[PDB]
Amino acid sequence: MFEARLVQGSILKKVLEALKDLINEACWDISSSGVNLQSMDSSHVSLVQLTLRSEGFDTYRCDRNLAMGVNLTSMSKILKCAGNEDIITLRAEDNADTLALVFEAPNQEKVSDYEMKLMDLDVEQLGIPEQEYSCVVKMPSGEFARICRDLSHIGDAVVISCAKDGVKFSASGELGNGNIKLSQTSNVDKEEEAVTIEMNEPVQLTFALRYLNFFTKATPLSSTVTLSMSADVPLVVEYKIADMGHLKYYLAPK
């Protein structure tokens, strides 16, 4: 008896557009705390941790722990029919094999009613210890999006080098070389337009750009992205879901 009413469905819309392309099949663990997704990709290179919390929904009601097998492509298609101001209602029965989506317009005159198939879950949900990282950059999401797009033309790999004074992105492909460098902002009149670095040990890591573009697709959710990297451990691309959850992407270095 899962029933979640949320009024700004844009968020739920955006999340789908974020995760539609990276993960094909996912498993939503529904509990009395919130909706939690944690999955990998085909070749086990990246990891996605989505967490939306009970206090964010306008009406959360859960009875038993539900394990739903979702096809995020079909689901993204169904929420494509969702208005950005539409109110979305997730619903399911304690044992049902179908998830019900209800899109309802602010002016109570249109009620779209969709029902998606669930499938057999078979996911190994490993744990990722929330840890303390050597380098932690906190920048606007738009410029990170820029840099990833720009450097995606040069090569298939990026080299992030965090130091004491600046963050540096570097690519080197079959058609040349590229080096973008962002620096520390002082006192800018916008909290979400500032770059700040918290260094404890300079880091020198090599990642793949395709998955960074995948992660970049989640840009409209937050104005600020946080990168967290350290030697030999994965990079954490984190977007805040304003007053409700978090989205976390992880990548294993070269």
Partner: peptide, 9 residues
């Protein structure tokens, strides 16, 4: 290389 993935967790 490509580390894949856990390998790390």
């Amino acid at each position: 290389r490509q580390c894949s993935m856990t390998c790390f967790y």
